[PDB]
Amino acid sequence: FRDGLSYLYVEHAVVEREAGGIGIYDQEGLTLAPVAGLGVLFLGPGTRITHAAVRLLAENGCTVAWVGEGMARFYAQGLGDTRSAARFYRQARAWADPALHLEVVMRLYRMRFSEPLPEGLTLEQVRGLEGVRVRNAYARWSRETGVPWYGRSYDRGADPVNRALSAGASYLYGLAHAAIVSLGFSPALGFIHTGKLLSFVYDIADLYKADYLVPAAFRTVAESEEAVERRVRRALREAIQEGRLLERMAEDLLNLFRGL
Amino acid sequence: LSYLYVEHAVVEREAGGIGIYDQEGLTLAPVAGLGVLFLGPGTRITHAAVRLLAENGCTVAWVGEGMARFYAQGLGDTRSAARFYRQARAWADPALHLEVVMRLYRMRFSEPLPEGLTLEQVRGLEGVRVRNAYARWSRETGVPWYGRAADPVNRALSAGASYLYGLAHAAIVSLGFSPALGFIHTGKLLSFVYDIADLYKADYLVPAAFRTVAESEEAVERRVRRALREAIQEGRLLERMAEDLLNLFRGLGLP
């Protein structure tokens, strides 16, 4: 219930178009949700969405993120509800020019730090310093909370509870992608991450995972060991409700390119 | 290009690749090396099918009735923004921006272009060509072409233009280009959609709209759209749109 921004995890249901929004036909019956101001529709496993529902979501400035036990991270985007998108052009100008591209990269690195950083660093210096902070925070909640030191690695497939970290990363990525397209940007013009049509999603997600993803994924697996995915998602939603993330996610996006 | 349009079906994962269950029989498509899956109006897709698709570098474009309209596109994290990056680099640099503009002008021109004009002169040649084709199909179809009201050929023109814009948008996002980085049209999202639709307006939109404003006058809009949907598949409009999009950005290379 956050203003103008995402809600709605959905699993084992059918998502159709109904008068007044989307109708999710679940085992629990029929639930109806207004698509206006819905942000992301998270589709877990067992979900079937109809073309009418996808059309409604995309025409109403929404995004749909296919999340689940890893395996793909697949998204859907319309034209975004910034249909007066001149800021797309600002992002493109920044991305294209090496000077401004480095300026934005330095802003994106300098933003992940809670305390401000000294006069002016070089790329290698800030990159190494950021890695230092990352491993520090990774070990600081292993020390604040029972979980063993080594939660570091990720991919291919069957891991300790660090899959709760990635399980929550899925939702955070969906949220970041929704914010990007909702403000009328391109998730394809990445500045720190290059190569993908979704790189800027990672660029913008990394700014907040240290405060939301790492705590919630260790906190909700101290007294867990068992139901990692759904409970990490529940804690993440509780934190984004109690704290302010979507609003802060917006203002950071609109200032990233303003002033270059 | 390797695409697959599907309408009025259910899309599930079926042991090898995509299984589209249709209300007559069953069609099965290999997920490996599939470019875009175009989802028409009647389609419902399953989470399992979406997972299979995204694992194989696939994208899904939710399009209208026979690709007349564009709604949304599905992005997998194996999608490569290199054609997007090429178009963006071209768009940003004035030299390459002009090169792209000139390629876009010379592509629709049957008559050779002088390779030595200023942009105003090439623009005037563009105006001359469009009005020329307008009056040459006013001749062939034998329909008057008045340069207040909305003649059944001028409302059919727009009815088909909408369809051409839908196709252009779908093809652009499906090949991984930006529908917002326009070179001749600038300023708005869909600018590059207009840029690439103009390349085919003279060859597809004007002929069909005069032919069907000739053979009837009443239900012009829907009949023009039907004629275009035939000519978009009888010919290789999608394929012709694909190769033109993939060759446009071969200027000063920076991979």
From Swiss-Prot, chain B:
Q: What is the species of this protein?
A: Thermus thermophilus (strain ATCC 27634 / DSM 579 / HB8)
Q: Which gene encodes it?
A: cas1-2
Q: Which GO biological process entries does UniProt record here?
A: defense response to virus; maintenance of CRISPR repeat elements
The protein's Enzyme Commission number:
3.1.-.-
Which named protein is this?
CRISPR-associated endonuclease Cas1 2
Top-tier EC class: hydrolase
Organismal lineage: Bacteria, Thermotogati, Deinococcota, Deinococci, Thermales
| Positions annotated to bind Mn(2+) | E126, H185, D198
Family that this chain belongs to: Belongs to the CRISPR-associated endonuclease Cas1 family.
Could you tell me the keywords of this UniProt record? Antiviral defense, DNA-binding, Endonuclease, Hydrolase, Magnesium, Manganese, Metal-binding, Nuclease, Plasmid
